């Protein structure tokens, strides 16, 4: 037999990096004193059609995450004033911790939240998150309620990603976008199910 | 390079028959005999105790029969919810904090040699249904069960109530009852859950669906509707956290 | 320290690379996995599951329960097949929505055998014979029972067997074939013909139904993963 | 020299990395350590220390010496418990300020057994019986002595034993449980009931006091470190 | 990679009883006997000489007793300051440059069978106190000791004088005297300090605190206030740097 | 037993990098001749609430330090004139040595003080300081006086950090901020104590 | 070629580091050392030399 | 374990130890502590009936009421 089944394996079928979100931040002008924008996004796969649809083939799952960040920037007005190099703080808030609510706040200080400091113009930043969960596997479908006479189908908690620019305001407003590329790793699945059609999918098992 | 291992640079599915793997366990005896050897063991796993147990609940519980007419669309039940009022098994269910068990489901249809039709029995794990909009009242109809519907809470038959086509439904553990070949089916369901043990009162491990693949027809002047009977037996039960009453 | 030279391809992100990365939550203990029963280790294990073939995607009987049944009535026949099905597992509308079709829709090259099963859901007192014939690639479908009899066929006797199985082997000049192709118009066909009429003893109904199931054998394979799912408007 | 390629994730600072760094004061001799007595090697060794439970955080008896005492008076009782304590080690105001509570407040997941001790600080000439009952998770607290008698309980005899110990085991569907959670309203309870009145021989005072202590057993654990302390205004 | 090792990529706590580890050392004999085997050895360490010694100072020094009434809030002393005028131990203290020693503290309470109450004895290492604002006059009250207070220099009882709650105070080496069970306590304190030896005249190694956990009560017409007595014995003393006088 | 106590260990509980200070410097315009600013900061943990509160659980301590510096810069006015790349001098003054008092001074010459020269736009600078102390361990609480009939509770001496910009003034004023991230290493503790409440803490054991 | 990742602390000059450097005058032969008598190998060897104590630093 | 060392000063009625029926619940093995009663300077006496006194005590009473013989 000169044909192998090694390209349909679970790792081959799933472990591929795809963009999951685009987070916008900016460093405003030092003249106008409006608040500096910061980005917050909760980790969830229910916004990428392809990854979700490939996950709904099964009901129980386990995997680690590999996250990469691609940062780009641009001036947003025709001014001769320029800016120096920029450094970005990319904070990962594990599942269960408070989320930032203002750009300057103790949440960008806690020793518990691990951060990355990335200087513009260098190789993209990368990290790996392990399997974080209280059960022995994620559950895409859950026939249960939180309270019995309450939500019908548990939701999975992965963490949060917050992003800001460490530099203080320049005299020039510069806007930046960070694209997050996620890659599941060491994945295992259980109990296959029939796949759903492309009907925009849905928030739950509702249709 | 790194000690933490988050980054290191990196036949049993098709409803096995009982005789294949476990044949030395015909302890089922006594609602039927000689049909226990043509049963399907879901995922090829036999229910087992939690390694490194009531007796009354070992009995069979024969729910009410249901009438298959020339118009029915399907029926469904939830496990363990369907047994929430059946004697000591229900008593244990309601007076403990945690519990686990497998099941053995036996389906029978009483038909003559002049009836024709076909039924499919499917065992869906974590059978999250949906109508056409749920509450705790809809997802738990009790031993009465619920009924699918075609084109209250009534999922869609050809979508199996969860948006997926009926034809693919054969990925789930299943069996087919063709009136001209056999009229009995048996499923041995092990315990499936992400946790090693869980609260029975809030979580339904399994769902059982019965759908007519080919409608019912019969010779003139015969019985215009035949009965279908379910018999459920818990296996390897065990509970923890016993309350009073 | 150590002299080093930077080769081309450094400080670039290739979305298909396999490199060790720094862990973000070290000194963290993960919940150990338990022995859940049904473990899937390859997506071909899902293609080997028989699933019903929707035979009537006509708008009338579309997305209902009637599209999986083939009706055998009492009216006279015209020596034309009961059903003729093409062997494009990912290019036939009546065969692309099965589990096999949906696993093939995620890849580009496929190769292997197939197996079809037909099930008769009529009365126990009925008798008759049907002819199930396979037309190999490059041959247009047969149109009369005599033409199909001279090919490769099996006579299925309704009366002593309720299900008939037919395995289609693997024939191609190349080692692989494209899932989605145009102008091929080959791959063979499977046809069912009335070898004999259907006889009933009494007022027994003279209208029967037959169902069909399709599966892949243990020598099937796919490659060159391709995904095109998009909800864009 | 040697060809090399720069992977993604270079020239970045990850605040959780473990890399060798250049020393700033080489050729420097450090003061050797001495054998100081009390060495702590794990923060769970501090959770296994019994500490008094503040039973009365009422504004009246708050942040004083009266909040650690439970008074047993001579007035008739109404078959209601002397004290009922929930088993949320980090979600009960009367149990979060102990050493166990303050070690749990630095983490997210916890799991293990607990042990409570009650100490009677009355006269040597007093006699009586108390009923200490444990209600498991998912059961609302008992309200009458008969209800508590039918559960898991121990009769503590004031008169031949001065302290009573009760070990609460570990019950949960998951291997770990969240320290801070809402809508749980479970975990069990520990209640104390008047099985029998308190008898004194003479003008001996009829008002006694009892104290309580809580500790963690040798199978306790925590994980997913979380710190939220901030003095911001 | 680097030779300097500043960067290379990288039961005994709960007041052990004497019999557990060191039982062959009942050399304490003679202020009490048979209560030496129910004593606590702080941090499970026995005082020892400085490996690779007066005789008169080996005696016991019985400070004055103090009256526990129905109103007292607590008492505290400092070691070695409390023994700065007790004979030859104080003489050696004041006429040497360096000195070290462990201690053995025995606390006793004289009460009848009709008294009730509870005391806690805590041995705080480096017991930095604070009032409600210190000078050398406040931190060193001598053998007279000092008194806590509730809602001069008087720390707060429920905070232990250092801002930390009283309930947690049981992390320190401690013992409980419950009048209905026992009325004597014994603590064997080894030498604790960051330096292997230090000047006694300026630095207080230990502090001893006594706090009423449950107030005092008694039958009518009894003694309205009972006495508490402390007895301190230095152990394994040794001094260096002897001056004249 | 499938549960480990390896996340409550002392190293795990303490060895986490957190920002301790922000030091501001600048390179002024070559027209106005005002003095060039330089930054000086004495190493002390009594300004970060979290690290201190986690240290007050105990009384005696030992550990090495790992220091990292994150530098950012910005123009402070809308002028077309620009600046070249900047180099920063980051001098560590061990415990016992003189502190700089002017931007140009022999203190930025002594062979005894080790310095780091960091060029803007590259990986952050890092060093490691060993256990520097005359006793056999740090003491968070000290019941003693310096002079007997004087300070009540010894204070620990770790060193000093001074920072300046080597470049001479440009025609454009550019302001820079350096954030210091400290990480204790190889830490040991002794003699546990009860923890204090969050009452702004205090300078000593006073409350 | 070989995959590599750049850690923090690269392209910096620490005045207390001990790294091999490129020689500027290779293929050069140095004058060999001779056995001069008085060799000092530690600065404490100089502290063990008795020296007179100035007892009267008075301005006179 | 309601008392220890007083079990050796107990009286066995008629010198016969209870025994199974020769040629068995576990929950009912427990002890059932009825309510206490107050002996004052006026009381005359108290009396109970067995097994009637245990007709509502958990599983022993359940078995009592759901069997024909016992």
From Swiss-Prot, chains A, F:
Highest taxon above the source species: Viruses
Cellular compartments annotated: Virion; Host cytoplasm
Protein function: Forms an icosahedral capsid of pseudo T=3 symmetry with capsid proteins VP2 and VP3. The capsid is 300 Angstroms in diameter, composed of 60 copies of each capsid protein and enclosing the viral positive strand RNA genome. Capsid protein VP1 mainly forms the vertices of the capsid. Capsid protein VP1 interacts with host cell receptor PVR to provide virion attachment to target host epithelial cells.
Assembly and interaction partners: Interacts with capsid protein VP0, and capsid protein VP3 to form heterotrimeric protomers. Five protomers subsequently associate to form pentamers which serve as building blocks for the capsid. Interacts with capsid protein VP2, capsid protein VP3 and capsid protein VP4 following cleavage of capsid protein VP0. Interacts with human PVR.
Protein's UniProt name: Capsid protein VP1
Organism this protein belongs to: Poliovirus type 1 (strain Mahoney)
Lineage, broadest ranks: Viruses, Riboviria, Orthornavirae, Pisuviricota, Pisoniviricetes
